[PDB]
Design a protein around this nucleic acid. Structure first.
Ligand SMILES: [K+]
Ligand SMILES: [K+]
Ligand SMILES: [K+]
Ligand SMILES: [K+]
Ligand SMILES: [K+]
Ligand SMILES: [K+]
Ligand SMILES: [Mg+2]
Ligand SMILES: [Mg+2]
Ligand SMILES: [Mg+2]
Ligand SMILES: [Mg+2]
Ligand SMILES: [Mg+2]
Ligand SMILES: [Mg+2]
Ligand SMILES: [Mg+2]
Ligand SMILES: [Mg+2]
Ligand SMILES: [Mg+2]
Ligand SMILES: [Mg+2]
Ligand SMILES: [Mg+2]
Ligand SMILES: [Mg+2]
Ligand SMILES: [Mg+2]
Ligand SMILES: [Mg+2]
Ligand SMILES: [Mg+2]
Ligand SMILES: [Mg+2]
Ligand SMILES: [Mg+2]
Ligand SMILES: [Mg+2]
Ligand SMILES: [Mg+2]
Ligand SMILES: [Mg+2]
Ligand SMILES: [Mg+2]
Ligand SMILES: [Mg+2]
Ligand SMILES: [Mg+2]
Ligand SMILES: [Mg+2]
Ligand SMILES: [Mg+2]
Ligand SMILES: [Mg+2]
Ligand SMILES: [Mg+2]
Ligand SMILES: [Mg+2]
Ligand SMILES: [Zn+2]
Lengths: 101, 49, 116, 154, 111, 145, 53
RNA sequence: GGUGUAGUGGUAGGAGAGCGUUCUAAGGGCGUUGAAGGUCGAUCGUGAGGACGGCUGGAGCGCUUAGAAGUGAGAAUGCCG
RNA sequence: UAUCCGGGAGUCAGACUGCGAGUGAUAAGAUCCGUAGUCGAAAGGGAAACAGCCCAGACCACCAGCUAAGGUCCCAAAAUA
RNA sequence: UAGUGAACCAGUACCGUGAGGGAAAGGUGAAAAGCACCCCGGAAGGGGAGUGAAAUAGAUCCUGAAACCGUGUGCCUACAACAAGUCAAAGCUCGUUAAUGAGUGAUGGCGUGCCUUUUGUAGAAUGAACCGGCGAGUUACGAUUGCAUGCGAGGUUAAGUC
């Protein structure tokens, strides 16, 4: 079995036992989470949502909040005296799936 | 007061504006004198009236 | 009192030179040729950090179009049938399906071809 | 500066002809010697400022000491001779172990000498009392005579 | 203990020219290397040959190694100081000359 | 991240055949270039040459509409002064139809190492000679495409 | 004329390929065994074609 | 401190907040069990930049607050090497 | 967002496009005004490339989506509609 | 590269007919204890031994950056054009301030350096060979505005004395 859910304004194919990295969820580490947003479920069977599947759900367990590598945004324009520099570490959350329905 | 805890009142003492020390200060590369001209010169400008 | 600046300059330049590793010849050894390339590298990075999305979207779309032609349909009519059938499946996902699970993609194609 | 430096005068080469930058003296700021552009000058940093502010500063410092309980008054400090260990024993009896400023009447020379050499101790004679001295000190040993002298000069 | 070094410092010949000669002996036995340095008409051959002889002699005496199996493991010519001088050219201009030096260094290993 | 990138060498390459008795070379070469790029597959990723092989047949009979047989001129230059050679598509059709189809497809491919390789996967032959019967190729219908 | 551009370490080292020198004609002397240039007197023993010189 | 709304291209230029260097006064603390400096690291901070380790090195240097400036260089057909 | 008071400036070389006029040969990427825009000081997408044209205003991240002008046979995403 | 031009036998060396101009150049080690003796070599210079806490502290002597010159080694490179990077990425090799690891990089997409000055410069307009150091809005006295403090229709001393 596998599934396709919607999270962080995007979508994720996923399976059980696997960990995914998604946008920051507003919940502490080691805690349960559930996605009632599944777009599709598949494997030997296959069922689709319109847009979401009928009352399905996907269960996960948070493992960590973290921050990606610092990306540096150096805006520059030649001969015009001006540059800006920013750093940015975007936060993420890691979640290991535990069940699909 | 304690010498290892000194503080002035707020707004009493201000940080100097150093000039020609990079572009991101804003006062850099021309010193607020702008592009070429008699005002952009050492001892330039004109009389007072 | 006098100020020399022995370490400030050197540290500030070592930073740039560490950023300039992998660059041909002078552009990893000399501060000027490096800095002039570090800034251009950052410009290109900021720009590619946008074009990346365009590129993968383009790629996914070509794949979806291929997998649809192999079922007797095109990208455009496929996606229109999906929007009709209220099927909100990302193109990334749909490309992954076209690659791995051609049967799931075929089911979606049947849905769309019914919607039309 | 460029003027007080031993040299100059000769323009080291022509304005033109050479493929060399325009230079006007061997001792301009951009030379291995070279007069300094502005640099320091002989300069007086001191400044007086209003008497009421000064006297309020003194009062404020002493009142802070009083509020923190960091005054210590005494009746005596009449040393037969200037031994410092006697004064150290006095500090120990009064339970002082920190910095201290010692205000003394104008003439208690033996006590001043006894207190002089100690590192924790500053000494001053009731008219030379200063904000810097007091604030630097954490506690203030003072003779009653000295306190009266302070309260009459102030 | 398997290897021995020899070095000639403040040598009065060119590094770029000595390197042409070292490029022959690097990866060779001392027999072939000495033969090549003898039948090399160049100038650096003599100094490199003296250095190589010195290395082998140090392997003999200071280390008691068996000369009949040795290999020139490393050999290299670092730059050295430059006593620099001045040719007078036409029209009062002086042109510099850099009388260069070389730090020849040979290493000879048991095998 | 996640999306598939065809490992260079792992994609299996099929062999196709295209008869061109009456088709325009441009349209022929368009479907053919799609095939050679490997855009006919979902495995397509633009840096590994996921495409398939193409055999072309009866290229002498490739259709040229209008006056292209006598007015479509192929120019090339020897990069010597005055060394501009012109050839008509009709003569080129009758004599060296391979070169005709090749120029078409080559212009319609990318000008990369990748496209220069993909142009090798093409195999044009006037008539139905078909020396490649050992590769088990499959007929492809240009008319539907 | 004038270079107008400094050459790189790469371009130097690519000129320096064929600047290397070769040494050739070495064989062993049938008398003394040490190596000599072919068609040259052995400088050690002086023999050439088995005759002292 | 939080919620919402709206906004945050930018030269000359104006305004405000800062990082860093040298020194000083005070406080406090770290150094032959190895300071500064040098060098390599896949580290932290929105930025200036800041740490922690490994090797080198061999004696002075940080941290907090405040202050004073010869306070920050990539260009000057710039000077010296 | 306008006004008044006060501190600090910079700017007095402007360019093109569209419309209204002059000079011009109702020629000029010409010149001079008005009017609006853009550039200047503005990245991005299209016009092959292309400051000044068409769409549109970069605070950052996203291997998410909907559109603009412009486009959908291949190069090169999309209809051999 | 500071401070006197000069921390060193400096107004010296050197330049100039002359008046005159005018440099560069500091640091072993606690102590010379400065490498007896042996080997290669003509010697220099190395290699052992030995002094020393330390010799990669041995006269070019503390530290010993960069440019620059080399040696070796993991990956890549001889049908490819590319302001030389960036983004994606196969393969290979290593294993960290252990965290959506490091290095390399076939191949593909996009992309005409930095400054100055310009209506406008990738610019065939200017400057820079590179590295390192030095090198440009300061101070004194006054004026004015704001901020802060003290005092308040009274706020304040200058010189000078102690
Ligand atoms: K100004
Ligand atoms: K500097
Ligand atoms: K605007
Ligand atoms: K590339
Ligand atoms: K004032
Ligand atoms: K006031
Ligand atoms: Mg100040
Ligand atoms: Mg500005
Ligand atoms: Mg600048
Ligand atoms: Mg002007
Ligand atoms: Mg200027
Ligand atoms: Mg002006
Ligand atoms: Mg750029
Ligand atoms: Mg003078
Ligand atoms: Mg001086
Ligand atoms: Mg002469
Ligand atoms: Mg703004
Ligand atoms: Mg904006
Ligand atoms: Mg220091
Ligand atoms: Mg300065
Ligand atoms: Mg420089
Ligand atoms: Mg219009
Ligand atoms: Mg005009
Ligand atoms: Mg107009
Ligand atoms: Mg301008
Ligand atoms: Mg634009
Ligand atoms: Mg421009
Ligand atoms: Mg759409
Ligand atoms: Mg297409
Ligand atoms: Mg070819
Ligand atoms: Mg090849
Ligand atoms: Mg290019
Ligand atoms: Mg140029
Ligand atoms: Mg030049
Ligand atoms: Zn012989």
């Amino acid at each position: 079995m596998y599934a396709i859910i919607k999270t962080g304004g995007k979508q994720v194919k996923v399976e059980v036992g696997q960990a995914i990295y998604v946008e920051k969820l507003n919940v502490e580490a080691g805690e349960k989470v559930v996605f009632d947003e599944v777009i599709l479920v598949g494997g030997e069977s296959t069922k689709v949502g319109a847009p979401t599947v009928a009352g399905a759900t996907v269960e996960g367990t948070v493992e960590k909040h973290g921050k990606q590598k610092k990306v540096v945004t150096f805006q520059y324009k030649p001969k015009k005296h001006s540059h800006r520099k920013q750093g940015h570490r975007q936060p993420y959350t890691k979640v290991m799936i535990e069940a699909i329905n | 007061m304690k010498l290892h805890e000194l503080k002035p009142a707020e707004g009493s003492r201000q940080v100097r504006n150093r000039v020609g020390r990079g572009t991101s200060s804003g006062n850099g590369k021309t010193a607020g004198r702008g592009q070429k001209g008699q005002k952009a010169r050492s001892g330039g400008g004109v009389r007072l009236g | 009192a006098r100020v020399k600046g022995g370490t400030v300059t050197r540290k500030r330049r070592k930073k740039v030179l560490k950023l300039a590793k992998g660059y041909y010849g002078s552009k990893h050894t000399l501060f000027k040729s490096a800095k002039e390339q570090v800034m251009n590298s950052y410009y290109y990075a900021f720009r590619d950090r946008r074009q990346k999305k365009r590129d993968f979207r383009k790629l996914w779309i070509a794949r979806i179009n291929a997998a649809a032609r192999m079922n007797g349909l095109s990208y455009s009519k496929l996606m229109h049938g999906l929007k009709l059938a209220e099927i909100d499946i990302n193109r990334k996902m749909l490309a992954d399906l076209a690659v791995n699970d051609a049967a799931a993609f075929t089911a979606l194609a049947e849905q769309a071809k019914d919607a039309l | 500066n460029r003027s007080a430096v031993r040299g100059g005068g000769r323009k080291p080469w022509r304005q033109k002809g050479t493929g060399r930058a325009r230079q006007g003296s061997i001792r301009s700021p951009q030379w291995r010697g070279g007069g300094v552009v502005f640099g320091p000058t002989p300069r007086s940093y001191s400044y007086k400022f209003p008497k009421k502010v000064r006297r309020l500063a003194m009062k404020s410092v002493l009142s802070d000491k009083v509020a923190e309980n960091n005054l210590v008054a005494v009746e005596g400090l009449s040393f037969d001779a200037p031994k410092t260990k006697e004064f150290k024993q006095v500090l120990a009896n009064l339970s002082i172990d920190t910095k201290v400023l010692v205000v003394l009447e104008n003439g208690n020379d033996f006590a001043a000498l006894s207190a002089r050499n100690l590192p924790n101790v500053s000494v001053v004679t009731s008219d030379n009392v200063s904000v810097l001295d007091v604030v630097s000190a954490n506690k203030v040993l003072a003779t009653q005579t000295a306190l009266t002298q302070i309260e009459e000069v102030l | 203990i398997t290897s021995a070094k020899a070095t000639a410092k403040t040598v009065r010949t060119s590094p770029r020219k000595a390197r042409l000669v070292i490029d022959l002996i690097r990866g060779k036995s001392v027999a072939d290397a000495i033969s090549i340095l003898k039948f090399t008409p160049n100038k650096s051959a003599g100094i490199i040959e003296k250095v190589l002889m010195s290395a082998v002699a140090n392997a003999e005496n200071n280390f008691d190694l068996d000369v009949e199996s040795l290999v020139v493991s490393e050999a290299f010519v670092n730059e050295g100081p430059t006593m620099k001088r001045f040719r007078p050219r036409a029209k009062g201009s002086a042109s510099p000359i850099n009388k260069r030096t070389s730090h020849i260094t040979v290493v000879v290993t048991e095998k | 991240r996640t999306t598939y990138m065809a490992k260079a060498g792992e994609v299996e390459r099929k062999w196709y055949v295209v008869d061109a008795t009456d088709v325009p070379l441009g349209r022929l070469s368009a479907v053919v270039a799609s095939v050679l790029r490997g855009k006919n597959k979902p495995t397509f990723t633009p840096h590994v040459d996921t495409g398939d092989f193409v055999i072309v047949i009866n290229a002498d009979k490739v259709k040229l509409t209008g006056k292209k047989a006598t007015d479509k001129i192929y120019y090339r230059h020897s990069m010597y002064p005055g060394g501009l050679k012109s050839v008509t598509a009709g003569e080129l059709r009758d004599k060296n139809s391979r070169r005709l189809i090749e120029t078409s497809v080559k212009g319609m491919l990318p000008k990369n190492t990748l496209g220069r390789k993909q142009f090798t996967k093409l195999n044009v032959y006037g008539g139905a000679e078909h020396p490649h019967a050992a590769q088990q190729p499959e007929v492809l219908d240009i008319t539907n495409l | 004329a004038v270079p107008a551009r400094r050459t790189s370490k790469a371009k130097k080292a690519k000129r320096r390929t064929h600047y290397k020198l070769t040494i050739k004609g070495l064989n062993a002397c049938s008398n003394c065994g040490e190596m000599k240039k072919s068609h040259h007197v052995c400088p050690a023993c002086g023999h050439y074609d088995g005759k002292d010189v």
